[PDB]
Every structure is written in structure tokens, then in C-alpha cells.
Design a protein around this nucleic acid. Sequence first.
DNA 1: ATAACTCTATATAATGTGCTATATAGAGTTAT
DNA 2: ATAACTCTATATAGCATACATTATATAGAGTTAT
DNA 3: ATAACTCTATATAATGTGCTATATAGAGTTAT
DNA 4: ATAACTCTATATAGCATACATTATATAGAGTTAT
Lengths: 323, 318, 323, 318
Amino acid sequence: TSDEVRKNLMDMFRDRQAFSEHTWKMLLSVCRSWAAWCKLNNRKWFPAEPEDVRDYLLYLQARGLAVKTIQQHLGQLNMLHRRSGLPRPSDSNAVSLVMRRIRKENVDAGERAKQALAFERTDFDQVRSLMENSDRCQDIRNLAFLGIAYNTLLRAAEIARIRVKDISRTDGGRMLIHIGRTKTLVSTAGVEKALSLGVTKLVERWISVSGVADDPNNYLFCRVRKNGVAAPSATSQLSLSALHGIFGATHRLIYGAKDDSGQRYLAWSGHSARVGAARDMARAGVSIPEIMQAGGWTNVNIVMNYIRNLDSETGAMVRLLED
Amino acid sequence: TSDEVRKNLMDMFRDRQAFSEHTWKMLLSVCRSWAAWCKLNNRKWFPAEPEDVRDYLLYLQARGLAVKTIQQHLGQLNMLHRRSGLPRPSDSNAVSLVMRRIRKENVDAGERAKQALAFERTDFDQVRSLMENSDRCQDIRNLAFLGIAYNTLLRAAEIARIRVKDISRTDGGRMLIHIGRTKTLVSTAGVEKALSLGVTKLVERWISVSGVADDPNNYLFCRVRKNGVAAPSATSQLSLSALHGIFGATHRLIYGAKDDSGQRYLAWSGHSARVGAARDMARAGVSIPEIMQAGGWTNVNIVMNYIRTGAMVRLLED
Amino acid sequence: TSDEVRKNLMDMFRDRQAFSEHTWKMLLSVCRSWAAWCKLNNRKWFPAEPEDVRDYLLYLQARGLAVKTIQQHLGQLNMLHRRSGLPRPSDSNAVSLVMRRIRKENVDAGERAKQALAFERTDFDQVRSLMENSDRCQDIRNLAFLGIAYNTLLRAAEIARIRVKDISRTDGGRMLIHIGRTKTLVSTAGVEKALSLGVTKLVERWISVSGVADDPNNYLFCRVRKNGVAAPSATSQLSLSALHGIFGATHRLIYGAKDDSGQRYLAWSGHSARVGAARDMARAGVSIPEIMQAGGWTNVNIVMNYIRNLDSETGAMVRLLED
Amino acid sequence: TSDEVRKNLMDMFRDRQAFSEHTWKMLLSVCRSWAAWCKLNNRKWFPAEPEDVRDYLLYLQARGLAVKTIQQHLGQLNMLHRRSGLPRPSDSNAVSLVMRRIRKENVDAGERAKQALAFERTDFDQVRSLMENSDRCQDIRNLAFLGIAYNTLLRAAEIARIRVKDISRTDGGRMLIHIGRTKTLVSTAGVEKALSLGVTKLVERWISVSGVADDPNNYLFCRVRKNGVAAPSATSQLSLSALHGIFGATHRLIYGAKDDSGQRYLAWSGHSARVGAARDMARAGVSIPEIMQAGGWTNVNIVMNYIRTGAMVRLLED
DNA sequence: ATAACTCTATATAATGTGCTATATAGAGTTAT
DNA sequence: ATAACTCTATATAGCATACATTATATAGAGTTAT
DNA sequence: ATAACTCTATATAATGTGCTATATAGAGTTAT
DNA sequence: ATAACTCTATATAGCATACATTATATAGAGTTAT
């Protein structure tokens, strides 16, 4: 079915906007890896043979990769074949059995899904107690950022996407922000966010120095060069990669040099403040709805994963036992 | 074989009644639209060719239609085919992928599935405070309808199906409405919707002045002519466009005539009370399970967007 | 596949205790009906042809039978074929479509599932206010019955199955009864039931007159002949059919002669007292667990169908509206 | 072909690890029992003949085995076959129907699936009031185990899998136990079970006197010898028969030696605390949803029989 | 002449069984 | 030269559409008892 | 010699993805 | 003769196992550091 398959991949290329760029990136990434392994192991990479895919999955595990990562591989390989008319590796008894086995084997060696390191009020006040005083342009900007981040629980991409026009001024000069936190359709279109007398002051400065207010198609956050000189733009926002940096560079300021070699959530990442505001909100007995919403989350099983080591969430059994 | 297909479809038309009348209306509406696009481009309408279907869908999207209508067209084309015993247009990559792309391209340019303007307690109470005083038959009917809509959360289509024989009472004197079929259920079990003492009265007055109780099998709701005379029927229902107009009329009453925009949902509509009651209940702190039994829902997902605090500014301001 | 089918039905006959006698009865009943219709309509009854089964289902509906009844037919026909190696009528597009259609059509003409006519406290006191005084042996017995029935919510079959040994004597001479209300395995084995100072007195008499206490392998309830003379037995209980009669004969005493011609729950049936005690228990805000259990019910959707026209159960919306 | 079958099964043995070790133990235990019955009656053990399988099942039932064991045999025989790529013995009327008949015949003669004797709060409190005072290592271990069992509702198999590295604290100073795999779940997500301040102490004392914290990857629980010396290990777990004996020993302590009957559940067992805690929670009025999060259950059915009032005598006595 | 529909069309939003018992009218059975 | 990014590519955590109907939304054109 | 296991066996009870983003170390890019 | 059933057969309301594992229950036989 070479002509069938040819037609299929042309279909795939013609309507490639059917998937997100990130999806294609991961697809490409898995194929390069699978292909490179087939080459090294003398195997045909396309179509993929059950037995070869199985050996690979084990090679992935022996590489000490996580279950969820091995899934992404299988997943990408399955889609490739499903999208080129060939049988999916998953629908093979040897790949179904081995994934199952590897899954069980890994969870039984302590495979732990990780999450972001909480950036809670305790850290906000702390970093605040360390920078509200500096005249450093990148220090005032970075303070605003973690101010917005923490206050609003907005996704990093949403903080970047922001523009000066998107900012209002409420009760006692408080601030508000017309946003958009939904990959649309049956959801919301936007949401509007408000600040506190605290982070409203922090941002004020950013505005004051950045001088960004000058061209309102401008974005609130912009790069700040080594001379401590900002650089507005209405056509370019700060890279997610940078926002992640403000978080990491900040953990370092307080905790210093990368830690316990090995990686993954060693410092605060872009989701830390959301993971942080959540617990705090839960720690003041707020509401899961007030929260779930407060962060735009739609299907709770995640928020809960965040507030799980908290005493509020201990469980009916501990309640009973402490009569 | 073209022979089963002639049969499979003939077999479908034989028991058309297994499907909503509105399912047929859309199937034929779609086939019409499609066959017309095929006739224009010199293409075979059936069986559909994946590439033809894909050009059609892109044509729709170019016509500026909603992602939801475009999907409606595809789903009808998929039912025709599948129930024919053939393979679904969606069964091919050209179609599968193009759809995703149209959605993605549309919803990444804004587009959102809208929802009706909410009709909540405050709205009810205001309309009632004004209409309560009318001795007009239309007014008494409309008010009773608006109360049931909001009280029960029933869909218009379902309220129009209420026959007099369907009402009963709790011992407390509250009206009970038996509900057979619904968008989400068709059983001899059905539901029993309880009205408030206030809404029960509103209904009682409507029955009284209308005479719909003359025949138990008469529909609860009917037309009332310019001379104020009702027009009860056991065979014909008050029309779906009528039930819709009660909602826009009422809204016209309080806020006046609607925009020149030609947009949808500029006033209340058949779904307004369902959406609004849904959240009045959220606000009231009702339990999602309860909010669910209200709107007869069986999952917990529409409930969810119908109502998407200052919790953080409060935590920060100490 | 005549030899295959022959083998299949021999299988069916060999292990026929695989199903309850009632099941076989209904099977036999449906086949007789289906067969008689095929004869009258010149059709082969076995195997059943989609088109013929479909015509039948419609004939069933035009007979004005209920949806649930038509299901029982299809159901029995499906099992026959499934249990003789032939295709099930259900797996045919014409029988799937027509059942669906007939279902919808019937629910849209007012097809109402019925249930038992409640035998609530109000009726107990009433009938009690009318018989506690009679010296009639069948009147004292019948009073005990509705006493047990109502108090315990036991299934009719359970009341019949009772034996004198199965009765104890608690706080202030109250009575108790070791029962069994489960078609076993992962359930209970028995349950023990207690009476009130009321129905404990009522039953006492039964015991006194019936003279049943004389041979404890005896059953509490026994037949009472026209001379008003009881007849004990340790090997024969009162027929469910009789117990149903005590209920019906009783409604008549209060409401007289069968009613509104047409049938189904016109008087109290064997389930009336359970349907009755339930609402009463719910009307005193008892508990669904206290109840569901009180009647042995395991999966709530039914108890609720019983307490649905009650003001307690009105719904969050009426609560809100009455602020 | 006999050729796929040789492969399908070879393929299963290759990745035996996809299944619980206990799944293999039973598969082989069953095949043993079956093959032995086949050898005795001059029958082919594989592939199984429906009629042979049916005689086997009736043989088991004649041996007086439980409906549940008989089903275990059939289910193992069905897995062998199905995972072989062949048809299941259960796939034939002879087998399907005989099973139903054995159940029906058995459960209509009494037979009930038993459940462990309950170990509730009162039982915990009593055992603790007595054992609390022991300075003995065994006693300190057993008490800490019994507390976790009851607190967490975890299965023994799962508690035996707790490694020191797995414990953490709430800020309140309560022990948190991370739970990877369970009878009902195998994910890198797993659960975090919180102990009470009281049970945390009990655990702390056990860790302290045992030295299991010498190696984070050491299992929480281990053997303690006659001389009171523990025996921590990162490779070997305290045995399932040991965990079971803690329960019977404890019970022996309070009520003395068990009947001569040879029946099951005459004393507490690995499941006792799960059953009892389950109902302590019912009594306490806990919410089934909550009772569910307790015992990690995802449906709502076992919860239900673990605890099967005088409501009517109260309504009647006025 | 018109209020108040109804109809028709396209456009778009919203949502989720198989075995056993029970009810009941009828026919049959016994003892009074 | 580097601070301060922006990109790349991979590891992994975190969602969200697709199916198959069934209904609503609403303007326009026709209907009928006044 | 033995307490306190462990093992082995049969017997029996109990229960429930595919696409997109994010994290992060690295390599590349500009302006200071 | 009938009251008082018991059976039959059908209409219909009301449940509850089967799948495929994965675990527990527990006695007996062996193990090892004391």
C-alpha cells in the first residue's frame, strides 16, 4: 500500500495545521529518536514492527526515562501509523503487554510524577522583602512579574501576551486586566483580572521605569538590557523561556546555585506561583470553585494534586481518629 | 453492494420515527446543501468522496459558518453514509484532518460557541412584578410559561409537550409536572417536576382563564388570539417559534427593541431560564449534584460553562 | 447448523437450572406467543427473521402492550437464539431501529411505568380502626399480616417463609424475627426484624387463635377456612397469590369493588406496604440509608421513585424560589 | 494455528511481569489442578474441550469448593485460552450455563462470600491501651502496623511495600505516606495517605527503636527476632503471612485461642481494619464519597456490604 | 386589517440490559 | 567580553476534542379568526 | 532449642488516551 | 354450593451477575540467628 501511504502523508502535510506546532515538534522528535535507534539496531523504522517497537520501549525504560515519556513515544508512533494507514503499534499484543509491564515495573521502583515547586505567599513576601527597595530596572520589572504571576495565577503565556491597553484602574486605584485564558470554542472568550494595593504598586513602578506606557499596543513586559535599559515593543513579547528565567533566576537569589543534581522542579518554574496561590487560597479555606476558577482550571483532579500535603485535606479518617 | 445501501437507507426511512424530527430536518437540510454544491461543481453527491467532502467543508468555512454548523454538515454526511452501511467521510484523513484544521483555525481567530442571555431570579421577579397585574389572557399565559421555564429548567420543546392530564399535586398543594421525553431521555419513567407555591398559582390562573382543563389530554399551553380568546388543542402544540417569542417579547418589554446588529442572543430566548436558573443555583450554593437533578443533566459539563470573586486581593490585603 | 443447534438446545436442557423457573416460564410464554403469531402470519418461528420479528414487535405495540413488555419479548427471543447459536434479533438494524422508534413513540403518548399503591400509616391505622375488634379468625390473621408487612417492609415471600421458631421477644415483650432477604453470595445471609407494641399485639392474637405455635417447624401464616378455622403446616406456606389477596381483599373492604376498569395497581398489591412505610419513613425525615436498608433495597434509584411526589423531595429550585 | 498459540503464550511468558505475581501463581495453580484432572480421566488439557471443562467445574463443586474458587478456576482457564488467541471455555454454552447453575445451586443452599472480622476504633483503642506500654520491639512494630492499617485502610500487601523514603510530613507534623501501586491502581501518581498525630507517634516510635531509617530505601516494616533485634532490608519485605499473623496474634491477645472449627475469619486478618474502618466511617456519618477516598475505592459497591436501627418501631410507637 | 400565531429554512448550541420478580385475571381444588 | 536574551530539542506534566444525534435561534413567508 | 519468621500451596474474596503544554539544559544572538 | 384457596399464564416492575484480573486466608513445611 505504498501509493495509499503516499496519499496519506500528503494528506498529513496538506492539512498540517490540524495539529499544534508543539505536537509536530514532538512527533518529529520521537521519529528522529526511533529512527536513530532503528539505524543503530538495523531495523526498518517505517512501518514499525511490533517486535522492534517493543525492544525500543524497553530501551527507553533502560534509558531510565519516565513512563509518561515512553507513552509519548508510543503515542507518536501510533499516530504516525494511524495517519498513514498502517496498523498502530499499540494494537499489537507484544506492545500492549510490554507497556503494561514497564508501567507496573516503574511505578514499583518509585516512579513519581513531579509538579511545580510552590511559590507561595511566604516566598512572595520574602522576595518582596528583598527587592521592593532596589532601583534596578530588571529588579523592579521582575518584582512586578512575580506580583502579577502570584496574584492572578495567570499562565506565563498570558502574562507575556499582556499589553498596556489591557490594564484598568479600580477601587482606590486598584488595577484590572482584560485577559484570555482559553483555547476557545465552548469556553470563555476572556476573563478580566484585578490586583491588590501591593502588586498594583509594584507594577506601577515597572510602568514608570519601563516607560512602556508610551505605545499602548505595547506589552506590559519587555526585555531589560545589561545597561538596565528597557525596550518596549507592541510586536514582540518576552519569550516564555525568559519568564521561566525570572522564576529560576529568582529561586537562585534566595537559595543559590542549581541544586541536588538530576533535575526537574529544583527551583521555581513558570507554574510555581499558580501552584503556590492555590494552596494559600486553600489554606485560608477559600473554595474549590473559587479556586479552580481563580486559576482557570476546569477539571479539579489537578488542583487537588496541589493541595494534597496540606492539613486541611487530611481525610475523614484522621478527623474520626482525632474525635 | 449498492443493493444493501438501497436497502439500508430504505430501512432507515421506514422507521424514520426512531429519530427526532429535527434529526431528519437537518439530515435533509444538509443533503440539500451538499447535493447543491455537488451539482454546481459537477460532483457525485453519493456516495461522497472524501476529497469532495473536504472541499465542501472548506467552502462552508469560507462562507463564514460557525465551527458548529460545519460540524453539523459533516455529522449528517457521516450518518447518511454510516447508516447506509458505507464508510464515513470522517473515516478518511482528508476529512478528519480538515475538520480539526477548520476548528483550530476558527477558534484561533476568536470564535466561541455562544450561549443564551441568562434569565435569572431578579429578571423573573421584575417581569412578574410588572405582568402580575395584567388581566390579559396572553399576559397570564406568558407569565405562567416564564415561571415554569425558570422553575423547572425544562426546555421549551418539552414545556410545549405538557398536556393537562400531566399535572398533579404534592400534598402541600404544589403543582407536579410529569415529564416523559427529553433531549437526553425517552422512557416510560420520565420525571416529575415540582413547581413552587408561587409558580403553581401562576399556572392555576392560566389554566383557569384559558379553559385548557376542558380536556385532560389538551396541551397545557396554546395560542391566545387578539381578542384574548385562547385556543386549546389536544393535537396541536403552541409552536416552538411562539415559545421563543415569549422570551424576546418579555425582554422587549423591560429593555425595549433589540440592536440593529443581527447578532444572536440580544434578548432572552428559549434557553435563557435554563442557563440563568443554573447559576442562580450556583450562587445560592446549591450542590452540583442538586444543580444536576434540576436541569435533568446526567454528566456535569454544560453546567460548568453556564456560569464561568476577589479571593486573591483579599488574601494579599491581609 | 442444525446439528450445532441441536447440541445447543441439549446444552440448554441439560443445565436448565442455570435459570430461575420464572425465567423459563416467561421464555415459554414468549415463544408460544411468537409461534402462534408466526403461524397465523405464515412465518417460520425458528430461527426468527429480522423482518418477521420486527412485524411482531409492531403487532405487540398495536396490541397496546407496554414498552417494557415488548422488551421482554425481544429479550426472550434474543436469548433463545443466543442460546442455540443463532444470530440475535437485536443485532439486526431493522429490529434495533424499530424498538427505538416504538419506544419513543410510546413514551410520547403517555406510557407510564406504574408502581404499587402506597399502603401508608394512614391506611394501617384505618384498617386497624376497622378490624382490631373482630373475633373473626381470618380477620385477626389478616390484621397481623398487614402489621408485619407494614412494620418490617419484608417481601411477601419473606412473610410467607416465616416460621414460629423464627420469632423472639425483646424490650417490654416486643417481638423479633430472624429472616433472609437475599438471593445470596456477596450479600447478607439473614437480617433479624423487630416489631412494635402495636403489631406485636396483633400477631399475638394470630398466634393465640391459629394455635400455630404448636409445631414450631410451623409457619406463622397459614390458611383459614370458611368455618373460620386455621390450618397449621410446617411443610406448606401461604401462596404468594393469597398474600396478594389479603392486600386486595383489604382495599376492597375500605374502597369496595374493583375500580376504574383497565387494571394495574388499582388496589394494594403485595408491595404496597413497602412503598408505604418508605414514604412515611421519608416523611419523618429518616435517612435514605436508614430506609434503603429498612427495606433491603440496595440501589436507591427505586426508593426515590417512591418518595417523589413528596414535599420533602421537591428540589433545590423550589427551595430557592421560596427563599 | 498451533503456531500462533505457541507464540501467543510464549509472548505472554516473556512479559509475565505485566501481571501480578499472584495472577501467575493462580494461573499455574489452576492449570496444575486441571491438568491433573485431565491426566486422571484421560483428557487433553489444552486446548480445553468445553465438555471436559464442564465436568471439571462440576467436580470442583462436588469437592465442595466455594462458588468463588470454582469461578477462579474457570477464569484462569479462560485467560490461558483467550490470551493464547483461542476461544474461551466460557465461550461455550456447556460452560457458561454450568457455571450459572453451580452458583445458583450453591447460593440457593446458603453459601455466602464471607468478609473479614471487623477491626474498628474500639478494637484499636483497646489493643493500643494494652500494647502502648510494651517496650518490646515486636510490640512497638505491631502496634504501628495496626495503626496504619486502620488509619490508612491500605491493604497489607501495600503497607509491606512502604519504604522509609516514602514518608513525609504535613506542616502540622502528621506523617504522610506515599502510595505507588495498589490492587486497583498502578501509576506514577499514586496516593499520599495521612496518619493521625497519634498514629504518627506510634510510627515514629517504631522507626526509632528499629533503625529502619538507616537506609531511606529500606522498607518501613521488617522482621524482629526473638532477641528483639529488628532486621531491616531494602530488598526483602516483611512477609504477607507475617502481616496476617500480626492480626491474628493481636486478636489472640484479647480473646485468646481460636475455635477448633477450622473456619475462616475466626480472628482478625489482613482485611479486618479495612472493613471496620469502612463502617466506623459510616457510623460517624462520613460521606460515601469520603468513605471512598478513604479506602481508595473508585466505584461504590464493596463499601456497601461491609456494613449491612428501629426506625419503624419508632414511627409506630408515636 | 391585523394580532398573534405557524411554517420553513438555514444556522448553531448542547448532551448522553438480561434475568427474576410481581400483578392480576382466570381456572381449578377442597372442605365446609 | 558578557548580560540578557531567543531558539532548539527533548523530557514530562497537563489538558480537551471527536461521535452521534437532538435541540435551539430566528428571520421570513404564510394563516386565520377576528 | 526456638521465636519469629518465609515459603508454598490451595482456597476464596474483591474491584476497576491522544494532543498540547511546560521544564530545562544547551546553543545561538545582540547590544553593551 | 361456596369461601378460601392454589395454580397458570401473561403483563410488567424490579433487580444482579459476568469479565478479567489482583488480592487475601491460612495451614504446613522449611529457615536462621540466636
